[PDB]
Amino acid sequence: GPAFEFAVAMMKRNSSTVKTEYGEFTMLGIYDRWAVLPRHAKPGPTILMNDQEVGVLDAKELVDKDGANLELTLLKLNRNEKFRDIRGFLAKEEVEVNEAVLAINTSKFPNMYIPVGQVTEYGFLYLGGTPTKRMLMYNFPTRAGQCGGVLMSTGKVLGIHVGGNGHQGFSAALLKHYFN
Amino acid sequence: GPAFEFAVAMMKRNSSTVKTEYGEFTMLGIYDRWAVLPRHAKPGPTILMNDQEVGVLDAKELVDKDGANLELTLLKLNRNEKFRDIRGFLAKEEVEVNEAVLAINTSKFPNMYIPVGQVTEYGFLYLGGTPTKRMLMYNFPTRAGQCGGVLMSTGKVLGIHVGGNGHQGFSAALLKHYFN
Ligand SMILES: *[C@@H](CC(=O)OCC)[C@H](C[C@@H]1CCNC1=O)NC(=O)[C@H](Cc1ccccc1)NC(=O)[C@H](COC(C)(C)C)NC(=O)OCc1ccccc1
Ligand SMILES: *[C@@H](CC(=O)OCC)[C@H](C[C@@H]1CCNC1=O)NC(=O)[C@H](Cc1ccccc1)NC(=O)[C@H](COC(C)(C)C)NC(=O)OCc1ccccc1
C-alpha cells in the first residue's frame, strides 16, 4: 500500500523513457545530470529521452574491485536541467525484503507497477553469459522491455531490473556509494 | 499516462480485496451494495472483504439470453455503507481498444497496475471447460490470484479479468445494463 505511493512519486519525478540503438528502457535520474541504465542498454552519444534527443557526455560501465560486471551504466546527460537528487533514497548495500515494487515506464509498458514479493541477495549470476555480481533476485515479472525498471520498497530504491529467466527476475543493486 | 491515473482513483475508491473459500480476488463495488466477482470465485453467505467478514445477501451468476455463461457473479453485500456509484463509467457494450490497464489489488499482489496493450472482442471461449461468452482478449498478464482484476481505459471500466493461458488474458465484459 505505502510502497506503491512512494514508487509513483519517485517515477513521476525521476524516471524517463529511454530509447537506445538496442531497445526501449526505463531510466532513473539520480542527481545533477547523472542517470542510470542497465549496462546492456549501451547508450551512444545521443539517446532519445521521452521522445527527445539528448546528448550523453559520459557513460561509465560499473564493475567491482576485481573488474566483475555489475550490469549498470551511469550516464551523464548533456542537458541543462538537473535531476531531483535522490541519493538519500538509495540503499547503502544489497537489500533483502519480503515485499518490493518493480516500476517500469516505457511507451510500450507505460505506468506499470508490479509487486514482486520476496527479494533476496542472489549474489553471483551468469547473466546472458556474462559473470555478474550483486544481483537481487525476485519471483514473477520477466519480459523483454522491462529492463531499467526500478525496484523499490517504501522510502528506498533497491535496484534496477536487468534480466530474468522463467518466473525469476534480477535487479542490479543500486548502491548509494556508486554516486559521485 | 492518463489511463493509469483514472485506474488508481477507481481502485482507491471502489475496489477491495476479497477472500472466498476458493481463493483471493479483486472485487469492484458498483453502486449501492452491489459488487462484482468472477463466477468461479463462488462467494458464500460470508466473505472476507479487506480482512473483515461481510455478509452476502444475494449472489447472481450472470448468463446471456440463451443461458450461456458470462463468468461474472453480482453480489449484494449485507453492509450499511454504500459504494460510490460508478455505473456511469461502465461500457455499454464489448469494447476494443489499443491500450488498456489491468488493475489487480490483493494481499498477495497489492497495487498492481499492468498496461495490457491491445484488447479485442474475442467473443466465445472455452474457458476452463466452460462455454463462455463476451470475452475480451489481451496479451501479457496471466497468473493465479489476478482474477477480478479490473480492465480499464481512461474514463471507462471495460471488464473483469477471469482467465488466461500462456501470454493471453481474458476479461468478462462489464456491461452497464447488467446493473439494476
Ligand atoms: C531486459 C532488457 C531487454 O529487453 O533486452 C534488450 C537488450 C531483459 C529482461 C529479461 C528478459 C527475460 N526476462 C527478463 O527479465 N534483459 C535481458 O534480456 C538480459 C540482457 C543481458 C543482461 C546481462 C548481460 C547480457 C545481456 N538477458 C537475460 O535476462 C537473459 C535472457 O535469456 C533468455 C533466453 C531467457 C531470453 N537471461 C539469462 O541469461 O538468465 C540466466 C539464468 C538465470 C537464472 C536461472 C537460469 C538461467
Ligand atoms: C484467476 C482465478 C484463479 O486464480 O483461480 C482460482 C479459482 C485465474 C487466472 C488465469 C490462470 C492462468 N492465467 C490466468 O489469467 N483464472 C482461472 O484459473 C480460470 C478459472 C475458471 C474460469 C472459468 C471457468 C472455470 C474456471 N481458468 C483458466 O483461466 C484456465 C486456466 O488453465 C490452466 C491449465 C492454464 C491453469 N484457462 C483456460 O481454460 O484457457 C483455455 C484456453 C484459452 C485460450 C487458448 C488456449 C486455451
Give the ligand whose atoms come closest to the C-alpha of residue B143. Answer: 2
Q: Residue A106 gets which letter from DSSP?
A: -
Angle (CA) A67-A93-A157 rounded to 5° is 110
Ligand 1 close to Cβ of residue A107 (< 6 A): no
Distances, alpha carbon A180 to alpha carbons A41, A69, A92, A106, B127, in Å = 21, 19, 14, 27, 55
Q: To one decimal place, what's the resolution in Å? A: 2.1
Pocket of ligand 2 (CB under 6 A): B 22-23, 40, 71, 126-128, 130, 142-147, 162-165, 168-169
In whole angstroms, what is the distance from residue A59 CA to residue A44 CA? Answer: 9
Contacts of B115 in chain A (CB under 8 A): 108-112
As a dihedral over the C-alpha atoms of residue A19, residue A22, residue A26, residue A28, rounded to 10 degrees, the angle is: -90
Q: B95 is written with which cell numbers?
A: 469494447
Q: Which letter, b or e, does each residue of B126-158 get, where b requires 16 or more Cβ atoms within 10 Å of its Cβ?
A: ebeeeebbbbbbbebbbeebbbbbbbbbeebbb
Tell me the CA distances in angstroms from B107 to A153, B23, B104, one per residue in order. 16, 11, 10
**Cβ neighbours of residue A34 under 8 Å, at least 6 residues apart?**
A74, A75, A76, A77, A83, A179
Is the CA virtual torsion B113, B36, B91, B64 positive or negative?
Answer: positive
Distance CA(A71)–CA(A63), nearest Å, equals 8
| DSSP string for A19-65 | EETTEEEEEEEEEBTEEEEEGGG---SEEEETTEEEEEEEEEEEE-T
Closest CA to A162 of A139, A140, A145: A145
User: What experimental approach yielded this model?
Assistant: X-ray
CA A152 – CA A160 distance, rounded (Å):
9
Residue A122 φ then ψ, to 5°: -75, -40
**Ligand 1 pocket member A142 (CB < 6 A):** yes
Do the bridges between strand B15-20 and strand B69-77 make them parallel or antiparallel, or are there none, so unpaired?
unpaired
The structural domains of chain B, ordered by start, are: 1-14+84-180 (2.40.10.10), 15-83 (2.40.10.10)
Backbone angles phi, psi at A124, to 5 degrees: -90, 135
3-state secondary structure of A71: strand
Cβ–Cβ < 8 Å for A72, A34: no
Catalytic residue from among A61, A96, A121, A147: A147
CA-only gyration radius of chain B, Å:
15
HSE-CB of A49 using CA atoms within 13 angstroms: 24
> Quick check: B140 and A140 CB within 8 A?
no
Residue carrying C-alpha cell 449484494: B76
Q: How far is B36 from B159, CA to CA, in rounded Å?
A: 10
B121 catalytic per annotation: no
The catalytic residue among A5, A21, A24, A40 is A40
**φ, ψ dihedrals at A68, nearest 5°:** -65, 135
Q: Is-contact A122 A164, C-beta < 8 A?
A: no
Print the SS3 string covering chain B: CHHHHHHHHHHHHHEEEEEECCEEEEEEEEEECEEEEEHHHCCCCEEEECCEEEEEEEEEEEECCCCCEEEEEEEEECCCCCECCCHHHEECCCCCECCCEEEECCCCCCCEEEECCCEEEEEEEEECCEEEEEEEEEECCCCCCCCCCEEEECCEEEEEEEEEECCEEEEEECEHHHCC
Can you tell me the distance from the alpha carbon of A7 to that of B146, in angstroms, rounded to the nearest whole number?
A: 21
- Separation CA A62–CA A55 (nearest Å): 20
Q: Which chain A residues contact residue B2 at CB under 8 A?
A: none
d(CA B70, CA B74): 11
Q: What is the rounded distance in angstroms from the CA atom of residue A179 to the CA atom of residue B45?
A: 57
